């Protein structure tokens, strides 16, 4: 469809102290492979990331605008954003074109920048937010993403446990789906330091 | 209007702006007016009395606060002072429409600094002849700020608006110091507002705002009279 | 203490001061008027006097009193078409009032707004600052009567009995003489004293034909302009 | 107006017959007349047409050779050190007219004699003239 | 209405700007800053104004502001009049990495926001922006540089400083110090405190009526470094220690 | 003298002197005098030129079937005020497929010389026109001025000496409403004739006729068109 | 917007702003060129560098194509704006019309561009004169230059800046075409003109030049003090 | 010095010199005066002859804005059409969003409001004119207005316009409002304006008559000299 | 007194307009004639230096096919008028796929002359000559900056136009034949002329009914020097 055109997917989980978020390697249009090098996650600020899923070029073109208006936020205020300031930002950013709406899932997982509080949110296409204590999915198939984070996801996880659960769903979630795959890197940040690491994807 | 709009301020042969030296000539011509941040919060004391003992002080208030958060005053003329109150009152919102929170101090009087900058170089119209003190309370430590007809603005611990902020300047120079409580801030504010004060101070000849790190609040004469009976 | 073009426009001179505003409340005394509100209790009552040169005048065009809306009658003061202009801003906005927020204006942010438009008109230095005064009642909820002045110097404000013109300066000093005292004040007692601080003032002592009375009470809430039938009434009544 | 005097249109009529007695009827005597100042703008071209209308001057600031040039002028009578060098000062310095460097050969000379030499060091030359220099950026 | 119009845009009969000169004689009082080449760095130091310890002093960098990840700016002039710039010139460099994703080279941005400025010279009756102040940055080929942005809407990018008229004499001075490839930022440094050392009027020159602020490069980040006031303490007293060697001679 | 700057000052007599030079610009105009009988209206303008090989500046042009127009002051203004006249024209001439009747019209023409003789930084506009037609009610000529008042008479003049016009217009003009068209335009011309020195003619080339009729529409007549009315003239005296 | 007079007719017929404009010209710093056979050389001096400073940040000479040079005078600010302008012209007569620019059309293009300039309301006229300089399509020499009233005119070498009358009064003695029948005698005659214009202090004299079709070329300043060695080793030839 | 200038601009005594010139310059037209009568109202103009100069029947100052309503005018003549034209295109905007007779009182106010807008700018300048309003119809009556150059708005039952002014009003007093009908006041007014205006002042005149009421049925036009005819029988009489 | 340009005189008229006038009388000067064979006309470059390129200068440039003109005074002012004006007889082109007359080029000029203002900039100081073959044959006109046209048969501009009037005036006729028209005009040429006639010093404007286009070019002209 319109979604599903360059396909995607985009998971975040809260972990204990620390917060995961992975979504796949695979760009294309419809069933043809392009590239695999293909870059959705992207890095706002520290201790603080950022996925989108959707139109390529809206996913690019929101990254770019959105950075820009952080740019200018942080470079007036020397604090660092907090994850608040940045979803109503995007809630914002979305709902300024009503009739003329893009076409994205805005998926934000970063900590407090003052405490190392987790937290995670995403929001609706043309900004309606959302925040959960558990995960926050976006992208082609439901009974994937929802199905084995409901069949997994514990309240407390060791930055351990955290990583394989959301390896073992977005695995599993991708290989029942054909529009994603083609590869999977993971996020998994903490108060301390960045970890991230890239899943071996079966290329089918 | 005629679109003629060309800035009426030159510069003068040293380079210094008529207008705006005028205007800082009018605003030290205003009513004398003080405030303090110290410790818990800030607190803002100004000075308003009556011409004629017809007037009523419940009508007209010289503090204006912004939000709940931060609150105003002022030295110099009333007319402006009102309008960019109006203006910066509008201005917080869209701030809060766009992130859904409170806008700091800080930059409030970036965005009201830039509006009176431009606003002296606007054209074909006079620079305003109103100083502002800022109060406001955020993130723990509040923050108190003033502003000058050129748009500037800096940060003070105390200072004071109107006819002999020098003088009392000085007073809570020495006397004014370190952090101490609501108490003590509103206690000094009442000595140094109580210099150039008539001879006669009631609940009525001033008014005393304070910043809260738990809010701004406007305290009535009721609470004015009860801390100032008993007048420092 | 002047240089350039301060005293044609409006800026500040060397000391600050702007001389147009200071010829605008000078501007006033030219309509050689009286102007003279009084509060009372439960009531509000405004009083003013004309002058008829000609006998081809009409006694009903002339009037100074204009209603804004059903609860709030006003008064004005110096040249007249400015008065008027004044006048149409007014009932404009207050409709405007009612068309955005659907219920009836307080009258006291419409002498905020006219006086935030008085300083739009003292700005610019290509426009006039229009010199005209203005003087408001209404009821309000539980605030009972209330008077305001709107000067064109861009503010407002309003009092218990307020008085502002040519010889009205005096009558202020003569009013806080009438008002305290204790002075309690009924309806009578403040119709009463509208006369009486415009006589002394001016001891002419005359026909109740000249003086027009605007009044606003709670017991009828609407504002009212009196019948000279009435107003001779109470003119033989505070003569005793 | 020195103590109580008027007007600006008085002195720009005792302005106007100076030039009328300057233009002139009818006076032929001589008495040739040299008027300089800084400011030509303030003048009014009433004067001009009279006179002086056929000759008038511009003074143009020093160049290089000329700055040099008058330097060797002041320093001709005052024995110099023999470290002395005019190119530093002349490139350092900017638009200096002829009692600049004259007013710098003074101080050097002053403080030539707080030492009490007759002969003035280059280094007390360029903090002597550090002195003006310094002046002329204090002020 | 048009006698009232002071005709600001027009020349002066002696082929002069009238209005342009009084736009350098504001920055002819007020700031004094300076700033200096550095090898894999740079250096910029700026008298702080109003000495007053009722100041809260809250506001981090306020005279130097930071406009871009890689660059700063050191004002002189009206404080607010240069904010409506710092604004501007921000969103520009700010827009052009919005375009390329990529750092805006220094020139192009900085001959842009002086054209800006000219756009009152030009044309309008405006006060022109009285405002000069200085730059530095790193870019992809020329490394560190400075500039100097000039009332008349010229820049005069440089690599020494002169803010304000009081700092000719630190251009002499500086010409006297000279030197090629020499950083060594402490070196530089301590040249600096000599400096203002002598042109500020204000003697044993404390530490909080000035302000140093450097730029050093690093992978990536380009550090951007302001500085505590006791390890620059060590810096002052250290060098009126040299110039205690250095009368050691007489 | 400085309060007559511009077109907005109320003078210390209240008379704005914009509007007053405006009138002395059209009195230096070569002269010309319109006028109409109870039928047929003519008007005759006398043209001036720079040197002997430069064209004779011509002052009658053409506008509509109905309606001729003279004129006298700036050429600019007028070829202006011209080319809004045959917009005018055609206007009514389009929509309402009819002639346009002489008084609304010069209405028009007060409404569109209004507006400058009062904002800022404006002029009025240098006007000799004289103007003739025929509505359902017959002959007109009406006459302008920089000041936007239009007057509608049997005979009027502007231009250099163009009183003396009217001194010979008095006596004879209760006689004009009578003659035909060509005694008619020979007491044109004898009109004109006065406002030269008595000592030059009054040639061919020099002079502009232009005669409109209840069923003659308007023609420009010049040169050998003028030759028959220039013709059986008796001379000024001595 | 801002609607006024800049500059009107004084009753003597004249301008003002325009025609005394120029004196922001006759202030400026020197330049000159000349135009020959086969290699182009143009001239600036005056510099006044602190010594201490980077000349190719304030560069006084610049390119609109690689065929076309630019040299002016005036203040700088001015000759950026209209350096852009100019860029953005004969960049867009590169997209259409896919030759390459004739010096005359963008000539006529600043020129018209200054003189529209000066007509408009509300207008500073421009402060600056410049010299267009290239080598035409076809090989051919050219050079024009301009006013402040904006009036593009070919010549045939340059005098503008101060001492532009004594500049030219000596390029009386350099047109003789034997000058130059070569090419580094074009290059040491261009340093033989302003060798006596200015100063000529062998530091702040520089130099662009554009042989035939190569792309413009600035020499560096050992060819400055070789150049001024031979004419200064001619002067004495000439004893 | 210099606070004649603009209108924008206030005085040292507080008022605007030029509405005060243009004001006085409107004084210097000829006298064109009205009145009002119980079943209608009498308009009255007097139109000079200077030379010849032209035909009669041209540009009268007296003019038609509305079926019901129409202008008798005085002052600089352009504006006083172009006032026309204002209150012509008013009533044509009442007539489109309403559908009835505009009631005079609110046409004279957007007149007034005109009048004093540009009273206010250096852009414009004063309006040079000041003419009589009157109106007739069964649901209001007779009403006749009187406007200024400042821009006040009021009524009368007559007014006087033009050089002789007060000495023409006087006697205006001895005509009476209601009682006396206008088939009569058409011959009082006749008898003022030839008695009025020495003839050595102006050489030779005219006088012109609109009239709108009760008897042409609210239609206002010219009631036509050559009906009655009754000016010169009377007025040639009148002179003893 | 700085009175907002757009001003009338006392007597009178507009300032700055009656001072362009005499904005041209400092001007270069030139001669155009017209007569039945064709029209001619004729300037002096009136040049400085050998700086000066003799090509560079051109006082004449060919509006139209059929349509010549000469400039005076200020000339970039002139440029907008005469491009401007090519545009118009271009689209006369377009919808009539005619000629557009030498006639209505002049007012399609002097329409738009004075647009000048501030609200709602300054005038021109160039004068025109209009040389042209219509339906008519051969024409010569004169306009000014104010708008004003005449048409001429022998006109002057420029800083001889007085006394070259005169003698022109004094040579004329309406029997003249093209060359001897030529000849007669650059004796007055070269009378007014400070330096010595060469083939740079003038250029001349020639049109006729057949014969074009022409313009014209020298080495002709450097034999009608020394046909005199």
């Given at each position: ?21 992975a ?31 959707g ?9 770019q ?20 300031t ?6 914002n ?8 709406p ?18 995670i949110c ?62 999977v890197?993971?996020?998994?940040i ?13 290329m089918? | ?24 000539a009018?605003?030290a ?5 003080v405030g ?29 606060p912004?939000?709940?958060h ?28 766009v992130?859904?929170?409170?806008i ?44 000058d ?25 020495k006397?004014?110091?370190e952090?101490?409580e ?7 504010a009442?000595?140094?507002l109580?210099?150039?004060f ?24 009721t609470?004015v ?8 | ?8 426009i ?11 505003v ?61 008065s ?13 009032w009612?068309?955005?927020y ?53 503010y ?24 305290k ?10 119709v ?18 000249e ?19 009435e107003?001779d ?8 | ?7 600006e ?11 009328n ?66 190119d530093?000062?002349?490139m ?6 002829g ?20 002969k003035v ?9 550090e ?9 | ?16 700007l009238?209005?342009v000169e ?13 700033g ?26 306020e ?12 004002v ?14 921000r ?20 001959t ?26 790193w ?89 505590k ?8 007293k250290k060098?009126?220690?040299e110039e ?7 | ?9 109320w ?7 914009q ?7 059209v ?15 003519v ?21 509509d ?17 011209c080319?809004?006249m ?38 009025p ?11 359902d009610?017959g ?40 003659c ?14 006065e ?12 002079v ?16 050998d068109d ?7 003239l008796?001379e000024?005296?001595? | ?18 025609e ?11 330049a ?6 086969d ?10 560098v ?9 560069r ?33 007569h590169?997209?259409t019309?896919?030759?390459?620019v ?16 000066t ?54 003695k350099?047109?003789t ?20 214009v ?42 | ?9 206030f005085?040292?005594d ?16 000829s006298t064109?005066?009205?009145?009002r ?5 009498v ?6 002859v ?5 035909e ?5 100052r007296?003019f038609?804005?509305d079926r ?18 204002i ?14 007779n ?6 004279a ?12 700018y250096?852009?414009?300048?004063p ?15 007779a ?6 150059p ?10 006087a316009?033009?050089k ?6 006087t ?8 009682e006396?009908?206008?088939?009569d ?47 010169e029988?009377?007025a ?5 | ?10 007597e ?12 041209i009388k ?15 006309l004729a ?13 560079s ?41 005619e000629?557009?007359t030498?006639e209505?080029?002049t007012q399609?000029?002097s ?6 203002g ?6 021109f ?32 501009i420029?800083?001889?136009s ?6 022109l005036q004094?040579?004329?006729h ?6 001897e ?21 003038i ?17 002709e ?8």
């Open positions: 469809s319109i979604m599903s055109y360059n396909g995607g997917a985009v998971m975040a989980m809260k972990g204990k102290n620390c917060v995961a978020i979504a796949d390697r695979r760009f294309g249009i419809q069933a043809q492979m392009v590239t695999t090098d293909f870059q959705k996650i992207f890095p706002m600020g520290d201790r603080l990331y950022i996925g989108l899923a139109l390529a070029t809206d996913v690019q073109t929101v990254a605008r959105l950075k820009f208006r952080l740019n200018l936020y942080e470079l007036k205020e020397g604090r660092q954003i907090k994850p608040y940045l979803m109503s930002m995007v809630a950013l979305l709902y300024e074109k009503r009739f003329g893009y076409y994205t899932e805005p998926v934000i997982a970063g900590l407090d920048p003052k405490t190392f509080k987790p937290f995403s929001l609706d296409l043309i900004g309606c937010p959302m925040v959960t204590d558990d995960f926050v999915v976006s992208g082609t198939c439901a009974e994937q993403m929802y199905g084995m984070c409901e069949s997994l996801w514990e309240p407390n996880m060791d930055p351990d446990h955290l990583f394989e659960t959301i390896s073992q769903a977005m695995l599993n979630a991708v290989d029942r789906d054909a529009v994603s795959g083609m590869g890197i993971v996020h998994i903490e108060k301390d330091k960045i970890t991230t690491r890239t899943l071996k994807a079966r089918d | 209007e005629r679109g003629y709009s060309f800035s009426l301020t030159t510069f003068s042969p040293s380079g210094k702006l008529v207008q705006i030296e005028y205007a800082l009018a605003v011509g205003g009513a004398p007016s303090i941040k110290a410790a818990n919060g800030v607190v803002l004391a100004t000075e308003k009395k009556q011409k004629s003992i017809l007037y009523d002080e419940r009508s007209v208030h010289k503090v204006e912004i939000t709940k931060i609150g105003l005053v002022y030295s110099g003329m009333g007319p402006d002072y009102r309008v960019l109150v109006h203006r910066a009152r509008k201005l917080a919102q869209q701030y809060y429409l992130y859904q929170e409170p700091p101090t800080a930059q409030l009087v970036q965005r009201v600094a830039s509006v009176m900058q431009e606003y002296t170089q606007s054209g074909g119209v006079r620079p305003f002849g109103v100083s502002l003190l800022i109060c406001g309370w955020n993130e723990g430590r509040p923050y108190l700020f003033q502003s007809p050129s748009g500037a603005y800096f940060a003070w611990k105390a200072t004071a608006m109107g006819k002999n902020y020098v003088n009392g300047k000085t007073f809570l120079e006397r004014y110091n952090d101490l609501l108490e003590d801030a509103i206690h000094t009442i000595l140094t109580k210099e150039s008539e001879g006669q101070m009631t609940e009525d000849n001033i008014e005393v705002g304070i910043c809260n790190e738990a809010g701004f609040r406007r305290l009535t004469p609470e009279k009860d801390y100032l009976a008993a007048i420092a | 203490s002047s240089a350039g073009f301060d005293r044609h409006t800026i500040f001179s060397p000391e600050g001061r702007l001389y147009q200071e010829y605008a409340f000078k501007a006033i005394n030219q309509g050689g008027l009286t102007s003279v509100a009084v509060r009372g209790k439960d009531c509000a009552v405004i009083v003013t006097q004309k002058k008829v040169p000609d006998k081809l005048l009409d006694s009903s065009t002339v009037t100074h009193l204009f209603k804004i809306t059903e609860n709030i009658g006003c008064v004005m003061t110096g040249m007249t078409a400015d008027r202009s004044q006048v149409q801003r007014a009932r404009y906005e207050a409709a405007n009612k068309y955005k659907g219920y009836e204006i307080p009258v006291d942010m419409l002498c905020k707004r006219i006086a935030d438009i008085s300083q739009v008109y003292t700005q610019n230095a290509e426009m006039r600052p229009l010199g005209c005064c203005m003087i408001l009642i209404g009821i309000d909820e539980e605030q009972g009567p209330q008077v305001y002045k709107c000067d064109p110097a861009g407002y404000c309003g009092f218990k009995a307020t008085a502002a013109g040519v010889k009205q300066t005096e009558s202020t000093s003569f009013l806080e003489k009438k008002v005292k204790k002075f309690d004040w009924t309806f009578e007692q403040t009463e004293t509208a006369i009486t601080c415009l006589s002394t003032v001016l001891s002419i002592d005359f026909k109740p034909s003086i027009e009375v605007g009044v606003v009470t709670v017991e009828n809430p609407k504002f009212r302009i009196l019948t000279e039938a107003i009434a109470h003119l033989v009544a505070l003569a005793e | 107006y020195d103590s109580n005097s008027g007007g249109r008085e002195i720009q009529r005792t302005m106007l017959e100076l030039l007695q300057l233009d002139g009827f009818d006076s032929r005597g001589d008495v040739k007349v040299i008027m300089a100042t800084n400011r030509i703008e303030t003048l009014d071209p009433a004067l001009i047409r009279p006179g002086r209308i056929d000759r008038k001057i511009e003074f143009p600031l020093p160049d290089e050779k000329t700055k040099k040039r008058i330097f060797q002028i002041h320093t001709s009578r005052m024995t110099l050190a023999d470290d002395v060098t005019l530093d000062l002349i350092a310095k900017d638009d200096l007219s009692a600049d460097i004259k007013a710098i050969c003074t101080e050097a000379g002053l403080m030539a004699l707080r030492e009490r030499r007759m060091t280059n280094e007390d030359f360029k903090k002597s003239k002195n003006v220099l310094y002046k002329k950026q204090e002020g | 209405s048009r006698r009232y119009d002071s005709r600001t845009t027009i020349f002066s009969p002696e082929g002069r009238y209005q009084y736009a350098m004689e504001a920055i002819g009082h007020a700031g004094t800053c300076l200096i080449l550095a090898n894999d760095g740079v250096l910029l130091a700026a008298e702080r104004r109003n000495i007053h310890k009722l100041l809260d002093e809250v506001f981090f960098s005279k130097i502001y930071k406009l871009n990840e890689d660059m700063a700016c050191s002189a002039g009206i404080t607010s009049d240069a904010n409506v710039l710092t604004n501007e010139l969103l520009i460099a700010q827009r052009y990495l919005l375009q390329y994703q990529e750092p805006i080279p220094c020139e192009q941005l900085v842009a926001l002086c054209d800006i400025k000219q756009a009152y010279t030009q044309f309008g009756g405006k006060r022109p922006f009285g405002v000069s102040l200085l730059y530095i940055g870019d992809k080929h020329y490394g560190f540089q400075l500039y100097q942005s000039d009332p008349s809407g010229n820049y005069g990018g440089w690599k020494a400083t002169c803010i304000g008229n009081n700092s000719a004499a630190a251009v002499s001075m500086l010409k006297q110090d000279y030197k090629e490839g020499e950083m060594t930022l402490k070196s530089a440094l301590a040249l600096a405190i000599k400096v203002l050392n002598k042109t500020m009027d204000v003697s044993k020159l404390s530490a909080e009526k000035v302000e140093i602020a450097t730029l050093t490069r690093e992978n990536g980040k380009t550090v951007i470094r302001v500085l006031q006791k390890e620059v303490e060590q810096l002052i060098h009126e220690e205690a060697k250095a009368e050691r001679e007489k | 003298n400085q309060y007559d700057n511009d077109v907005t000052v003078s210390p007599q209240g008379r704005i002197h509007i007053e030079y405006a009138m002395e610009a009195k230096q105009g070569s002269a010309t005098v319109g006028l109409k009988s109870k039928t047929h209206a008007l005759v303008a006398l043209k001036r030129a720079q040197s002997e090989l430069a064209a004779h500046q011509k002052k009658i042009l053409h506008v079937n109905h309606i001729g127009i003279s004129i006298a002051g700036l050429t600019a203004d007028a070829r202006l005020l080319n809004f045959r917009q005018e024209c055609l206007d009514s001439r389009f929509v309402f497929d009819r002639p346009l009747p002489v008084s609304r019209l010069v209405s028009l023409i007060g409404s569109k010389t209004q507006i400058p003789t009062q904002r800022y930084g404006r002029r506009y240098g006007v000799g026109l004289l103007i003739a037609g025929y509505d009610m002959p007109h000529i009406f006459q302008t001025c920089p000041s936007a008042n239009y007057f509608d008479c049997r005979a009027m003049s502007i231009g250099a000496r163009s009183q003396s016009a009217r001194t010979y217009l008095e006596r004879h003009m209760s006689e004009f409403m009578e035909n068209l060509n005694e008619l335009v020979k007491h044109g011309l004898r009109a004109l004739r406002t030269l020195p008595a000592e030059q003619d009054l040639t061919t080339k020099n502009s006729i232009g005669i409109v009729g209840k069923d003659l529409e308007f023609t420009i007549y010049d040169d003028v030759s028959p009315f220039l013709e059986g008796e000024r005296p001595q | 917007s801002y609607d006024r007079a800049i500059t009107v007719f004084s009753p003597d017929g004249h301008l003002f702003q325009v005394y404009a120029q004196e922001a010209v006759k202030k400026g710093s020197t000159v060129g000349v135009r020959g056979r290699i182009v050389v143009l001239g600036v001096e005056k510099k006044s602190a010594k201490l400073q980077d000349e190719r940040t304030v006084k000479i610049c390119a609109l194509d690689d065929n076309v040079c630019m040299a002016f005078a005036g203040l700088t600010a001015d000759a950026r704006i209209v350096i852009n302008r100019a860029r953005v012209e004969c960049q867009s590169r997209l019309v896919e030759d390459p004739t010096v005359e059309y963008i000539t006529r293009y600043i020129a018209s561009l200054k003189q529209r300039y007509q408009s309301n509300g207008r500073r006229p421009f402060g600056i004169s410049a010299l267009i300089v290239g080598f035409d399509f076809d090989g051919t020499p050219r050079l024009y230059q301009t006013d402040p009233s904006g009036t593009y005119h070919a010549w045939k070498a340059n005098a503008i800046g101060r001492g532009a009358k004594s500049v030219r009064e000596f390029l009386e350099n047109y075409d034997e000058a130059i029948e070569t090419d580094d005698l074009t290059i040491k005659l261009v340093i033989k003109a302003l060798l006596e200015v100063q000529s202090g062998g530091k702040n004299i520089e130099l662009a030049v554009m042989r035939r079709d190569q792309s413009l070329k600035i020499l560096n300043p050992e060819e400055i003090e070789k150049y001024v060695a031979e004419i200064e080793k001619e002067k004495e030839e000439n004893e | 010095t210099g606070y004649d200038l603009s209108a924008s601009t005085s040292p507080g008022r605007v010199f030029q509405v005060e010139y243009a004001m006085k310059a409107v004084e210097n037209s064109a005066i009205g009145i009568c119980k079943d209608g109202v308009f009255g103009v007097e139109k000079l200077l030379s010849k100069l032209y009669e029947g041209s540009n009268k007296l038609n804005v019901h309503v129409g202008m008798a005018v005085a002052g600089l003549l352009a504006d006083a059409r172009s006032l026309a034209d209150a012509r295109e008013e009533a044509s905007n009442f007539r489109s969003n309403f559908g009835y505009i009631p005079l009182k609110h046409l106010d957007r007149v007034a409001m005109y009048v004093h807008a540009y009273t206010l250096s852009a414009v300048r309006f040079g004119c000041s003419f009589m309003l009157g109106s007739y119809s069964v649901n209001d009556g009403q006749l207005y009187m406007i200024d400042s821009g006040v708005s009021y009524g009368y039952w007559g007014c316009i033009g002789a002014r007060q000495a023409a009003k006697e205006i007093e001895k005509l009476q409002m209601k006396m009908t206008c088939r006041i058409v011959k009082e007014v006749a008898k003022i304006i030839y008695i009025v205006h020495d003839e050595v002042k102006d050489k030779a005149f005219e006088l012109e008559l609109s009239w709108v009421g009760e008897l042409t049925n609210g239609r206002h036009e010219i009631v036509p000299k050559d009906i009655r005819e009754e000016a029988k009377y040639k009489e009148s002179l003893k | 007194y700085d009175r907002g340009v757009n001003t009338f005189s006392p009178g008229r507009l300032f700055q307009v009656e001072y362009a006038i005499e904005a400092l001007g270069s000067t030139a001669i155009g004639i017209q007569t039945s064979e064709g029209v001619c300037v002096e470059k009136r040049i400085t230096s050998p700086l000066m390129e003799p090509s200068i051109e006082k004449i440039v060919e509006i139209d096919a059929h349509i010549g003109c000469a400039m005076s005074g200020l000339i970039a002012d002139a440029k907008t008028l005469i491009d401007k004006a090519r545009v118009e007889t271009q689209n006369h082109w377009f919808t009539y796929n000629t557009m030498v209505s080029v399609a000029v329409n738009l002359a004075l647009q000048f501030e609200e709602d900039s300054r005038p100081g160039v004068a025109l000559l209009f040389g042209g073959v219509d339906e008519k044959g051969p024409q010569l006109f004169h306009m000014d900056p104010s708008g004003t046209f005449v048409q001429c048969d022998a006109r002057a420029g800083s001889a007085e006394g070259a009037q005169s003698s004094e040579v004329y309406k029997s003249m034949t093209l060359k028209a030529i000849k007669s005009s650059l004796i007055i040429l070269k009378q007014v002329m400070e330096e010595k006639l060469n083939a740079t010093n250029e001349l404007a020639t049109v006729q009914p057949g014969q074009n286009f022409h313009m014209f070019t020298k080495e002209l450097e034999e009608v020097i020394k046909d005199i």
